Amino acid sequence: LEKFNVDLMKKAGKELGLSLSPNEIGCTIADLIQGQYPEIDSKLQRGDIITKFNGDALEGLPFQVCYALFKGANGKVSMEVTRPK
């Protein structure tokens, strides 16, 4: 169980490219578009669990809310991630 951080500057017109799936402790990255952001291509992989987005703990929040927060991303983006086994 590795716990790390991802910080990036989102650019207008370029989506983070992450597809999400509900998880007990946050949002699982079910899929991602390689090449969107180097910070993502470098630190994230499918299966990674985002436990916090821009300082807000995602555990327990409805998946739909987590999705909305993700989609609302603008400017500086910060994520706390957990990578199983």
Coordinates of all heavy atoms in Angstrom, one line a residue:
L1 N 0.8 -1.2 0.0 CA 0.0 0.0 0.0 C 0.9 1.3 0.0 O 1.3 1.7 1.0 CB -0.9 0.0 1.2 CG -1.8 1.2 1.5 CD1 -3.1 0.8 2.2 CD2 -1.0 2.2 2.4
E2 N 1.1 1.8 -1.2 CA 1.8 3.1 -1.3 C 0.9 4.3 -1.4 O -0.1 4.2 -2.1 CB 2.7 3.0 -2.6 CG 3.5 1.8 -2.8 CD 4.3 1.8 -4.1 OE1 3.7 2.0 -5.2 OE2 5.5 1.7 -4.1
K3 N 1.2 5.3 -0.6 CA 0.4 6.5 -0.5 C 1.3 7.7 -1.0 O 2.3 8.0 -0.4 CB -0.1 6.7 0.9 CG -0.9 5.6 1.4 CD -1.5 5.9 2.8 CE -2.5 4.8 3.2 NZ -3.1 5.1 4.5
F4 N 0.9 8.3 -2.1 CA 1.6 9.4 -2.6 C 0.7 10.6 -3.1 O -0.5 10.5 -3.0 CB 2.4 8.9 -3.8 CG 1.6 8.3 -4.9 CD1 1.2 9.0 -6.0 CD2 1.4 6.9 -4.9 CE1 0.5 8.4 -7.0 CE2 0.6 6.3 -5.9 CZ 0.2 7.1 -7.0
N5 N 1.3 11.6 -3.6 CA 0.6 12.8 -4.0 C 0.8 13.1 -5.5 O 1.9 12.9 -6.1 CB 1.0 14.0 -3.2 CG 0.7 13.9 -1.8 OD1 -0.5 13.5 -1.4 ND2 1.7 14.1 -0.9
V6 N -0.2 13.8 -6.1 CA -0.1 14.2 -7.5 C -0.6 15.6 -7.5 O -1.6 16.0 -7.0 CB -1.0 13.3 -8.4 CG1 -0.9 13.8 -9.8 CG2 -0.5 11.9 -8.3
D7 N 0.3 16.5 -8.1 CA 0.0 17.9 -8.2 C 0.3 18.3 -9.6 O 1.3 18.0 -10.2 CB 0.8 18.7 -7.2 CG 0.5 18.4 -5.8 OD1 -0.5 18.8 -5.3 OD2 1.4 17.7 -5.2
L8 N -0.7 19.0 -10.2 CA -0.5 19.5 -11.6 C -1.3 20.7 -11.9 O -2.3 21.0 -11.2 CB -0.9 18.4 -12.6 CG -2.4 17.9 -12.5 CD1 -3.3 18.8 -13.3 CD2 -2.5 16.5 -13.1
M9 N -1.0 21.4 -12.9 CA -1.7 22.6 -13.4 C -2.6 22.2 -14.5 O -2.1 21.8 -15.6 CB -0.7 23.7 -13.8 CG -1.3 25.0 -14.4 SD -2.4 25.9 -13.1 CE -1.3 25.6 -11.5
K10 N -3.9 22.3 -14.3 CA -4.8 21.9 -15.4 C -4.8 23.0 -16.5 O -4.9 24.2 -16.1 CB -6.2 21.6 -14.9 CG -7.0 21.1 -16.0 CD -8.5 20.8 -15.6 CE -9.2 20.2 -16.8 NZ -9.1 21.1 -18.0
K11 N -4.8 22.6 -17.7 CA -4.9 23.6 -18.8 C -6.3 23.5 -19.4 O -6.9 22.5 -19.6 CB -3.8 23.2 -19.9 CG -2.4 23.4 -19.4 CD -1.4 23.3 -20.5 CE 0.0 23.6 -20.0 NZ 1.0 23.8 -21.2
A12 N -6.8 24.7 -19.8 CA -8.1 24.9 -20.4 C -8.1 24.1 -21.7 O -7.2 24.1 -22.5 CB -8.3 26.4 -20.7
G13 N -9.2 23.3 -21.9 CA -9.3 22.5 -23.1 C -8.7 21.1 -23.0 O -8.9 20.3 -23.9
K14 N -7.9 20.9 -22.0 CA -7.3 19.6 -21.9 C -7.7 18.9 -20.6 O -7.4 19.2 -19.5 CB -5.7 19.7 -21.8 CG -5.0 18.4 -22.0 CD -3.6 18.5 -21.5 CE -2.8 19.4 -22.4 NZ -1.3 19.5 -21.9
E15 N -8.6 17.8 -20.8 CA -9.1 17.1 -19.7 C -8.0 16.2 -19.0 O -7.0 15.9 -19.7 CB -10.2 16.1 -20.2 CG -11.1 16.7 -21.2 CD -12.2 15.7 -21.6 OE1 -11.9 14.5 -21.9 OE2 -13.4 16.0 -21.6
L16 N -8.2 15.9 -17.7 CA -7.2 15.1 -17.0 C -7.1 13.8 -17.7 O -6.0 13.1 -17.6 CB -7.6 15.0 -15.5 CG -7.8 16.3 -14.8 CD1 -8.1 16.1 -13.4 CD2 -6.5 17.1 -14.9
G17 N -8.2 13.3 -18.3 CA -8.2 12.0 -19.0 C -8.4 10.8 -18.1 O -8.0 9.7 -18.5
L18 N -8.9 11.0 -16.9 CA -9.1 9.9 -15.9 C -10.5 9.5 -15.8 O -11.4 10.3 -15.7 CB -8.6 10.3 -14.5 CG -7.2 10.8 -14.4 CD1 -7.0 11.5 -13.0 CD2 -6.3 9.7 -14.6
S19 N -10.8 8.1 -16.0 CA -12.1 7.6 -15.8 C -12.2 7.0 -14.4 O -11.2 6.4 -14.0 CB -12.3 6.5 -16.9 OG -12.4 7.0 -18.2
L20 N -13.3 7.3 -13.7 CA -13.4 6.9 -12.3 C -14.4 5.8 -12.1 O -15.4 5.6 -12.8 CB -13.7 8.1 -11.5 CG -12.8 9.3 -11.6 CD1 -13.3 10.4 -10.9 CD2 -11.4 8.9 -11.1
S21 N -14.2 5.0 -11.0 CA -15.0 4.0 -10.5 C -15.1 4.1 -9.0 O -14.2 4.5 -8.3 CB -14.4 2.6 -10.8 OG -15.0 2.1 -12.0
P22 N -16.3 3.8 -8.4 CA -16.5 4.0 -7.0 C -15.7 3.0 -6.2 O -15.4 1.9 -6.6 CB -18.0 3.7 -6.8 CG -18.3 2.8 -7.9 CD -17.5 3.4 -9.1
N23 N -15.2 3.5 -5.0 CA -14.4 2.6 -4.2 C -14.7 3.0 -2.7 O -15.1 4.1 -2.4 CB -12.9 2.9 -4.4 CG -12.0 2.1 -3.5 OD1 -11.9 2.3 -2.3 ND2 -11.4 1.0 -4.1
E24 N -14.6 2.0 -1.8 CA -14.9 2.1 -0.4 C -14.2 3.3 0.2 O -14.7 4.0 1.0 CB -14.5 0.9 0.3 CG -15.0 0.8 1.7 CD -14.8 -0.6 2.4 OE1 -13.6 -0.9 2.6 OE2 -15.8 -1.3 2.6
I25 N -12.9 3.5 -0.2 CA -12.1 4.6 0.4 C -11.8 5.8 -0.5 O -10.9 6.6 -0.3 CB -10.8 4.1 0.9 CG1 -9.9 3.6 -0.2 CG2 -11.0 3.0 1.9 CD1 -8.5 3.3 0.2
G26 N -12.6 5.9 -1.6 CA -12.4 7.0 -2.6 C -12.8 6.6 -4.0 O -13.8 5.9 -4.2
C27 N -12.1 7.2 -4.9 CA -12.3 6.9 -6.3 C -11.2 6.2 -7.0 O -10.1 6.6 -6.9 CB -12.6 8.2 -7.1 SG -14.1 9.0 -6.7
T28 N -11.6 5.0 -7.6 CA -10.6 4.2 -8.3 C -10.4 4.8 -9.7 O -11.4 5.2 -10.3 CB -11.1 2.8 -8.4 OG1 -11.1 2.2 -7.1 CG2 -10.1 1.9 -9.3
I29 N -9.2 4.8 -10.2 CA -8.9 5.3 -11.5 C -9.1 4.0 -12.4 O -8.2 3.1 -12.4 CB -7.5 5.8 -11.7 CG1 -7.4 7.1 -10.8 CG2 -7.2 6.2 -13.1 CD1 -6.0 7.7 -10.8
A30 N -10.2 3.9 -13.0 CA -10.5 2.7 -13.8 C -9.8 2.8 -15.2 O -9.6 1.7 -15.8 CB -12.0 2.6 -14.0
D31 N -9.5 4.0 -15.6 CA -8.9 4.1 -16.9 C -8.3 5.5 -17.1 O -8.7 6.4 -16.4 CB -9.9 3.8 -18.0 CG -9.3 3.6 -19.4 OD1 -8.1 3.2 -19.5 OD2 -10.1 3.7 -20.4
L32 N -7.3 5.7 -18.0 CA -6.7 7.0 -18.2 C -6.1 7.1 -19.5 O -5.6 6.2 -20.1 CB -5.7 7.3 -17.1 CG -4.4 6.5 -16.9 CD1 -3.4 7.0 -18.0 CD2 -3.8 6.8 -15.6
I33 N -6.2 8.3 -20.1 CA -5.7 8.6 -21.4 C -4.2 9.0 -21.3 O -3.9 10.1 -20.7 CB -6.4 9.8 -22.1 CG1 -7.9 9.5 -22.1 CG2 -5.9 10.1 -23.5 CD1 -8.8 10.7 -22.5
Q34 N -3.3 8.2 -21.7 CA -1.9 8.5 -21.6 C -1.6 9.7 -22.5 O -2.2 9.9 -23.5 CB -1.1 7.3 -22.1 CG 0.4 7.5 -22.1 CD 0.9 8.2 -23.4 OE1 2.1 8.6 -23.5 NE2 0.0 8.4 -24.3
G35 N -0.7 10.5 -22.0 CA -0.3 11.7 -22.7 C -1.0 13.0 -22.4 O -0.5 14.1 -22.9
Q36 N -2.0 13.0 -21.5 CA -2.7 14.3 -21.2 C -1.7 15.2 -20.3 O -1.4 16.3 -20.7 CB -3.9 14.0 -20.4 CG -5.1 13.4 -21.2 CD -5.5 14.2 -22.4 OE1 -4.9 14.0 -23.5 NE2 -6.4 15.2 -22.3
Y37 N -1.3 14.6 -19.2 CA -0.4 15.3 -18.3 C 0.8 14.5 -17.9 O 0.6 13.3 -17.5 CB -1.2 15.8 -17.1 CG -2.2 16.9 -17.4 CD1 -3.4 16.6 -17.9 CD2 -1.8 18.3 -17.3 CE1 -4.3 17.6 -18.2 CE2 -2.7 19.3 -17.6 CZ -4.0 18.9 -18.1 OH -4.9 19.9 -18.4
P38 N 2.0 15.0 -18.0 CA 3.2 14.2 -17.6 C 3.2 13.8 -16.1 O 3.6 12.7 -15.8 CB 4.4 15.2 -17.9 CG 3.7 16.5 -17.7 CD 2.4 16.3 -18.4
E39 N 2.6 14.6 -15.2 CA 2.5 14.2 -13.8 C 1.6 13.0 -13.6 O 1.8 12.2 -12.7 CB 1.9 15.4 -13.0 CG 2.7 16.7 -13.1 CD 2.3 17.6 -14.2 OE1 2.1 17.1 -15.3 OE2 2.3 18.8 -14.1
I40 N 0.6 12.8 -14.5 CA -0.2 11.6 -14.5 C 0.5 10.4 -15.1 O 0.6 9.4 -14.4 CB -1.5 11.8 -15.2 CG1 -2.3 13.0 -14.6 CG2 -2.4 10.6 -15.2 CD1 -3.6 13.3 -15.3
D41 N 1.0 10.6 -16.3 CA 1.7 9.5 -16.9 C 2.9 9.0 -16.0 O 3.2 7.8 -16.1 CB 2.3 10.0 -18.3 CG 1.2 10.3 -19.2 OD1 0.2 9.6 -19.3 OD2 1.4 11.4 -19.9
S42 N 3.4 9.9 -15.2 CA 4.5 9.5 -14.3 C 4.2 8.8 -13.0 O 4.8 7.8 -12.6 CB 5.4 10.7 -14.0 OG 5.8 11.4 -15.1
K43 N 3.1 9.3 -12.4 CA 2.7 8.7 -11.1 C 1.5 7.8 -11.0 O 1.3 7.1 -10.0 CB 2.6 9.8 -10.1 CG 3.9 10.7 -9.9 CD 3.6 11.7 -8.8 CE 4.9 12.4 -8.4 NZ 4.7 13.2 -7.2
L44 N 0.6 8.0 -11.9 CA -0.7 7.2 -11.8 C -0.8 6.0 -12.8 O -0.2 6.0 -13.9 CB -1.9 8.1 -12.0 CG -2.1 9.3 -11.0 CD1 -3.4 10.0 -11.4 CD2 -2.1 8.7 -9.6
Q45 N -1.6 5.0 -12.4 CA -1.9 3.8 -13.2 C -3.3 3.4 -12.8 O -3.8 3.8 -11.8 CB -0.9 2.7 -12.8 CG 0.5 2.9 -12.9 CD 1.3 1.6 -12.8 OE1 1.1 0.8 -11.9 NE2 2.3 1.4 -13.7
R46 N -3.9 2.6 -13.7 CA -5.2 2.1 -13.4 C -5.2 1.3 -12.1 O -4.2 0.7 -11.8 CB -5.7 1.1 -14.5 CG -5.8 1.7 -15.9 CD -6.3 0.7 -16.9 NE -7.5 0.0 -16.4 CZ -7.5 -1.3 -15.9 NH1 -6.4 -2.0 -15.8 NH2 -8.6 -1.8 -15.4
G47 N -6.3 1.4 -11.3 CA -6.3 0.7 -10.1 C -5.9 1.6 -8.9 O -6.2 1.2 -7.8
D48 N -5.3 2.7 -9.2 CA -4.9 3.6 -8.1 C -6.2 4.2 -7.5 O -7.2 4.5 -8.2 CB -4.0 4.8 -8.7 CG -2.6 4.3 -8.8 OD1 -2.3 3.2 -8.4 OD2 -1.8 5.1 -9.3
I49 N -6.1 4.5 -6.2 CA -7.3 5.0 -5.5 C -7.0 6.4 -5.0 O -6.1 6.7 -4.3 CB -7.7 4.2 -4.3 CG1 -8.0 2.7 -4.7 CG2 -9.0 4.7 -3.7 CD1 -8.2 1.8 -3.6
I50 N -7.8 7.4 -5.5 CA -7.7 8.8 -5.1 C -8.5 8.9 -3.8 O -9.8 8.7 -3.8 CB -8.3 9.7 -6.2 CG1 -7.5 9.4 -7.5 CG2 -8.0 11.2 -5.8 CD1 -8.1 10.0 -8.7
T51 N -7.9 9.2 -2.7 CA -8.5 9.3 -1.4 C -8.9 10.7 -1.0 O -9.7 11.0 -0.1 CB -7.6 8.7 -0.3 OG1 -6.4 9.4 -0.4 CG2 -7.5 7.2 -0.5
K52 N -8.3 11.7 -1.7 CA -8.5 13.1 -1.4 C -8.3 13.9 -2.7 O -7.3 13.7 -3.4 CB -7.6 13.6 -0.3 CG -8.0 14.9 0.3 CD -7.0 15.3 1.4 CE -7.1 14.4 2.6 NZ -6.4 15.0 3.8
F53 N -9.2 14.9 -2.9 CA -9.1 15.7 -4.1 C -9.1 17.2 -3.6 O -10.1 17.6 -3.1 CB -10.2 15.4 -5.1 CG -10.1 16.1 -6.4 CD1 -9.2 15.5 -7.3 CD2 -10.8 17.2 -6.8 CE1 -9.0 16.1 -8.6 CE2 -10.6 17.8 -8.0 CZ -9.7 17.2 -8.9
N54 N -8.1 17.9 -3.9 CA -7.9 19.3 -3.5 C -8.2 19.5 -2.0 O -8.9 20.5 -1.6 CB -8.8 20.2 -4.3 CG -8.4 20.3 -5.8 OD1 -7.2 20.2 -6.1 ND2 -9.4 20.5 -6.7
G55 N -7.7 18.6 -1.2 CA -7.9 18.7 0.2 C -9.2 18.1 0.8 O -9.3 17.9 2.0
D56 N -10.1 17.7 0.0 CA -11.3 17.1 0.4 C -11.3 15.6 0.4 O -11.1 14.9 -0.6 CB -12.5 17.6 -0.4 CG -12.7 19.1 -0.3 OD1 -12.8 19.6 0.9 OD2 -12.9 19.7 -1.3
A57 N -11.5 15.0 1.6 CA -11.5 13.5 1.7 C -12.7 13.0 1.0 O -13.8 13.4 1.1 CB -11.6 13.1 3.2
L58 N -12.5 12.0 0.1 CA -13.5 11.4 -0.7 C -14.2 10.2 -0.1 O -15.3 9.9 -0.5 CB -12.9 11.0 -2.1 CG -12.3 12.2 -2.9 CD1 -11.8 11.7 -4.2 CD2 -13.3 13.3 -3.0
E59 N -13.6 9.6 0.8 CA -14.2 8.4 1.5 C -15.5 8.7 2.1 O -15.7 9.6 2.9 CB -13.2 7.8 2.5 CG -13.8 6.7 3.4 CD -12.8 6.0 4.2 OE1 -11.7 6.5 4.3 OE2 -13.1 4.9 4.7
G60 N -16.5 7.9 1.7 CA -17.9 8.2 2.2 C -18.8 9.1 1.4 O -20.0 9.0 1.6
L61 N -18.2 9.9 0.6 CA -19.0 10.8 -0.2 C -19.6 10.0 -1.4 O -19.0 9.1 -1.9 CB -18.1 11.9 -0.9 CG -17.2 12.8 0.0 CD1 -16.4 13.7 -0.8 CD2 -18.0 13.5 1.1
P62 N -20.8 10.4 -1.8 CA -21.4 9.7 -2.9 C -20.5 9.7 -4.2 O -19.8 10.7 -4.4 CB -22.7 10.4 -3.2 CG -23.0 11.0 -1.8 CD -21.7 11.5 -1.4
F63 N -20.4 8.6 -4.9 CA -19.5 8.6 -6.1 C -19.8 9.8 -7.0 O -18.9 10.4 -7.6 CB -19.7 7.3 -6.9 CG -18.9 7.3 -8.1 CD1 -17.5 7.1 -8.1 CD2 -19.5 7.4 -9.4 CE1 -16.7 7.1 -9.2 CE2 -18.7 7.4 -10.6 CZ -17.3 7.3 -10.5
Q64 N -21.1 10.1 -7.2 CA -21.5 11.2 -8.1 C -20.9 12.6 -7.7 O -20.7 13.4 -8.5 CB -23.0 11.3 -8.0 CG -23.7 12.2 -9.0 CD -25.2 11.9 -9.0 OE1 -25.6 10.8 -9.4 NE2 -26.0 12.9 -8.7
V65 N -20.7 12.8 -6.4 CA -20.2 14.0 -5.8 C -18.7 14.0 -6.2 O -18.2 15.1 -6.6 CB -20.4 14.1 -4.3 CG1 -19.5 15.2 -3.7 CG2 -21.8 14.4 -4.0
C66 N -18.0 12.9 -6.0 CA -16.6 12.8 -6.2 C -16.3 13.1 -7.7 O -15.4 13.8 -8.1 CB -16.1 11.4 -5.9 SG -16.3 10.9 -4.2
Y67 N -17.2 12.6 -8.5 CA -17.1 12.8 -10.0 C -17.3 14.3 -10.3 O -16.5 14.9 -11.0 CB -18.2 12.0 -10.7 CG -18.3 12.3 -12.2 CD1 -17.5 11.6 -13.1 CD2 -19.2 13.3 -12.7 CE1 -17.6 11.9 -14.4 CE2 -19.2 13.6 -14.0 CZ -18.4 12.9 -14.9 OH -18.5 13.1 -16.3
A68 N -18.3 14.9 -9.7 CA -18.5 16.3 -9.9 C -17.3 17.2 -9.5 O -17.0 18.1 -10.2 CB -19.8 16.8 -9.2
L69 N -16.7 16.9 -8.4 CA -15.6 17.6 -7.9 C -14.4 17.5 -8.9 O -13.7 18.4 -9.2 CB -15.1 17.1 -6.5 CG -16.0 17.5 -5.3 CD1 -15.5 16.7 -4.1 CD2 -16.0 19.0 -5.1
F70 N -14.3 16.3 -9.4 CA -13.2 16.0 -10.4 C -13.4 16.8 -11.6 O -12.5 17.4 -12.1 CB -13.2 14.5 -10.7 CG -11.9 13.8 -10.6 CD1 -11.5 13.2 -9.5 CD2 -11.0 13.9 -11.7 CE1 -10.3 12.6 -9.3 CE2 -9.7 13.3 -11.6 CZ -9.4 12.7 -10.4
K71 N -14.7 16.8 -12.1 CA -15.0 17.5 -13.3 C -14.9 19.0 -13.2 O -14.7 19.7 -14.1 CB -16.4 17.1 -13.8 CG -16.4 16.2 -15.1 CD -15.3 15.1 -15.0 CE -15.3 14.3 -16.3 NZ -15.1 15.2 -17.5
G72 N -15.0 19.4 -11.9 CA -15.0 20.9 -11.6 C -13.6 21.4 -11.6 O -13.3 22.6 -11.5
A73 N -12.6 20.5 -11.6 CA -11.2 20.8 -11.6 C -10.8 22.0 -12.5 O -11.1 22.0 -13.7 CB -10.3 19.6 -12.0
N74 N -10.1 22.9 -11.9 CA -9.7 24.1 -12.6 C -8.5 24.7 -12.0 O -8.4 25.0 -10.7 CB -10.8 25.1 -12.7 CG -10.5 26.3 -13.6 OD1 -9.8 27.2 -13.2 ND2 -11.1 26.3 -14.8
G75 N -7.4 25.0 -12.8 CA -6.2 25.6 -12.2 C -5.4 24.5 -11.5 O -5.1 23.4 -12.1
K76 N -4.9 24.8 -10.3 CA -4.1 23.9 -9.6 C -4.9 22.7 -9.1 O -6.0 22.9 -8.6 CB -3.4 24.5 -8.4 CG -2.3 23.7 -7.7 CD -2.7 23.3 -6.3 CE -3.8 22.3 -6.2 NZ -4.2 22.0 -4.8
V77 N -4.4 21.5 -9.4 CA -5.1 20.3 -9.0 C -4.2 19.4 -8.1 O -3.0 19.3 -8.3 CB -5.5 19.4 -10.2 CG1 -6.3 18.2 -9.8 CG2 -6.3 20.2 -11.2
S78 N -4.8 18.9 -7.0 CA -4.0 18.2 -6.0 C -4.8 16.9 -5.6 O -6.0 17.0 -5.3 CB -3.7 19.0 -4.8 OG -3.0 18.2 -3.8
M79 N -4.1 15.8 -5.6 CA -4.7 14.5 -5.3 C -3.9 13.7 -4.3 O -2.6 13.7 -4.4 CB -4.9 13.6 -6.5 CG -5.7 14.3 -7.7 SD -5.7 13.1 -9.2 CE -4.6 14.2 -10.4
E80 N -4.5 13.0 -3.4 CA -3.8 12.1 -2.5 C -4.2 10.7 -3.0 O -5.4 10.4 -3.1 CB -4.3 12.3 -1.0 CG -3.5 13.3 -0.3 CD -3.8 13.3 1.2 OE1 -3.6 12.3 1.8 OE2 -4.2 14.4 1.7
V81 N -3.2 9.9 -3.3 CA -3.4 8.6 -3.9 C -2.9 7.4 -3.1 O -1.8 7.5 -2.5 CB -2.9 8.5 -5.3 CG1 -3.2 7.2 -6.0 CG2 -3.4 9.7 -6.2
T82 N -3.6 6.3 -3.2 CA -3.2 5.0 -2.6 C -3.1 3.9 -3.7 O -4.1 3.8 -4.4 CB -4.2 4.5 -1.5 OG1 -4.3 5.5 -0.5 CG2 -3.7 3.2 -0.9
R83 N -2.0 3.2 -3.7 CA -1.8 2.2 -4.7 C -1.8 0.8 -4.1 O -0.8 0.4 -3.5 CB -0.6 2.4 -5.5 CG -0.3 1.3 -6.6 CD 0.8 1.7 -7.5 NE 0.5 2.9 -8.3 CZ 1.3 3.6 -9.1 NH1 2.6 3.1 -9.3 NH2 0.9 4.6 -9.8
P84 N -2.9 0.0 -4.2 CA -2.9 -1.4 -3.7 C -1.9 -2.4 -4.2 O -1.7 -2.4 -5.5 CB -4.4 -1.8 -3.9 CG -4.7 -1.0 -5.1 CD -4.1 0.3 -4.9
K85 N -1.3 -3.2 -3.3 CA -0.4 -4.2 -3.6 C 0.6 -3.9 -4.8 O 0.6 -4.7 -5.7 CB -1.1 -5.5 -3.9 CG -1.7 -6.2 -2.7 CD -3.0 -5.5 -2.3 CE -3.8 -6.2 -1.2 NZ -5.1 -5.6 -1.0

